[PDB]
């Protein structure tokens, strides 16, 4: 196809929850658009100063009166969300995913993606990387590796609060598998009920380029396979290597598509 000059603004809002292929999708969107896509990894590796800004936004988010129409407080919240996303062409993962409805209002010409998978596969992956149970010895390893990356209790607070925001829960028993599974199903159902079907593409793991590129009116990237990255096995290796070497920069060449 012809090469066209794309606008550097949010063009794709991904509502999929963590551990549903968000990092592969982030990489795929960057391959298509040649501009950055937001993701929790963007916070960890490039924008740790944003943690407090996202926390402030979530703290104020209960004051969002759903447009139409737009109220004054909603403008202030929407302005900070637009500021956080300046320079990006897409959003994936926490903390953004729970803001899908607000992002749809801020970027009325953006399209929405929802990545889904088997709920028990999702929970297993979540417990190995994002939310280990409080009695799991692996949790102490994750925390040791996280300190190497400079992540403190405020980072864990952001993950917890952005998950609570996505699930629309005032509190959440993070150690309760039944609660998490029910929240997962209700969240994915709600996205499909809320977003007009014309504006939504539901993606399953393994779907690859073709449905995504058709939805976005772009050519399939020539000679580039669809990304497959961020397996729990790979995250376990990363944690162990951070513990062993005590720095990101000593191991970063071992993890190419991070
Ligand atoms: O790809 C989607 C996606 C992948 C991972 C995460 N987070 C996993 C975590 C951050 C992390 C660490 C290392 C790396 C790496 F890759 F550099 F190694 C990446 C990310 C989140 C925090 N910690 C668990 C924890 C330990 N004690 C807690 C107490 C309360 C709550 C959580 C925790 C690992 C998210 N989040 O958090 O949205 C999204
Ligand atoms: N192209 C692809 N095909 C199949 N699974 C993929 C994939 N890209 C990522 N995944 C899976 O999606 C999960 C990572 O999602 P996220 O990036 O949102 O954290 C991992 O699950 P597992 O942990 O079960 O391996 C990973 O294996």
Keywords:
258 residues; alpha/beta; Rossmann fold; 5-stranded parallel sheet; 11 helices; 7% strand; binds ligand ULX; binds adenosine-3'-5'-diphosphate
Topology:
Blueprint: E1 12-14, H1 22-33, E2 37-38, H2 40-45, H3 50-60, H4 72-84, E3 90-91, H5 100-106, E4 111-116, H6 119-129, H7 137-148, H8 153-167, H9 177-194, E5 200-204, H10 209-216, H11 232-245
Parallel strand pairs: 1-3, 1-4, 2-3, 4-5
Bound molecules: ligand ULX and adenosine-3'-5'-diphosphate.
Residues 18, 22-23, 40, 44, 93-94, 129-131, 139, 142-143, 146, 149, 156, 159-160, 230, 235, 238-239 line the site of the ligand OCc1ccc(NC[C@@]2(Cc3ccc(C(F)(F)F)cc3)CCN(Cc3c[nH]c4ccccc34)C2)c(N(O)O)c1.
PDB class: transferase
Keywords: sulfotransferase, parasite, drug resistance, transferase
Assembly: monomeric
Largest sheet: 5 strands, parallel
Give the quaternary arrangement of the chains: monomer
**Spatial order of the strands forming the largest sheet:** 2-3-1-4-5
**Rg over CA atoms:** 18 Å
Helix content: 40-55%
CATH class: Alpha Beta
Estimate what percentage of residues fall within beta strands. 5-15%
SSE string, helix = H, strand = E? EHEHHHEHEHHHHEHH
The CATH architecture classification is 3-Layer(aba) Sandwich
The CATH topology label is Rossmann fold
Number of helical regions: 11
CATH superfamily: P-loop containing nucleotide triphosphate hydrolases
Report the strand count. Answer: 5
Morphology: globular
N-C termini distance:
29 Å
> What is the number of domains?
1
Pairing-aware structural class of the strands and helices?
alpha/beta
Write out the distinct hetero groups bound to the structure. the ligand OCc1ccc(NC[C@@]2(Cc3ccc(C(F)(F)F)cc3)CCN(Cc3c[nH]c4ccccc34)C2)c(N(O)O)c1, adenosine-3'-5'-diphosphate
């Amino acid at each position: 196809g012809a090469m066209i000059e794309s606008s550097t603004t949010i063009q794709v809002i991904s509502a999929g929850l963590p551990r549903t292929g968000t990092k592969s999708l982030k990489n795929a969107l960057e391959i298509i658009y040649h501009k950055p896509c937001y993701h929790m990894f963007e916070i960890i590796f490039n924008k740790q100063s944003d943690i407090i800004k996202w926390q402030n936004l979530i703290h104020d988010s209960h004051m969002i009166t759903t447009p139409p129409p737009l109220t004054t407080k909603t403008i202030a919240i929407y302005d900070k969300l637009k500021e956080l996303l300046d320079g990006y062409i897409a959003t994936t993962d926490l903390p953004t995913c729970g803001f899908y409805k607000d992002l749809m209002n801020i970027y009325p010409n953006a399209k929405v993606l929802l990545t889904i998978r088997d709920k028990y596969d999702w929970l297993h992956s979540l417990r190995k990387v994002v939310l280990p149970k409080s009695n799991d010895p692996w949790k102490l390893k994750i925390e040791e590796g996280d300190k190497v990356l400079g992540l403190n209790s405020d980072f864990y607070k952001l993950t917890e609060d952005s998950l609570k925001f996505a699930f629309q829960k005032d509190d959440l028993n993070f150690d309760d598998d039944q609660v998490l599974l029910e929240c997962y199903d209700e969240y994915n159902r709600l996205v499909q009920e809320t977003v007009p079907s014309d504006r939504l593409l539901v993606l399953r793991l393994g779907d690859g380029w073709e449905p995504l590129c058709k939805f976005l009116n772009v050519e399939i990237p020539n000679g580039i396979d669809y990304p497959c990255v961020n397996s729990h096995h790979q995250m376990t290796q990363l944690t162990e290597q951070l513990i062993k070497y005590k720095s990101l920069d000593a191991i970063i060449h071992m993890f190419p598509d991070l």
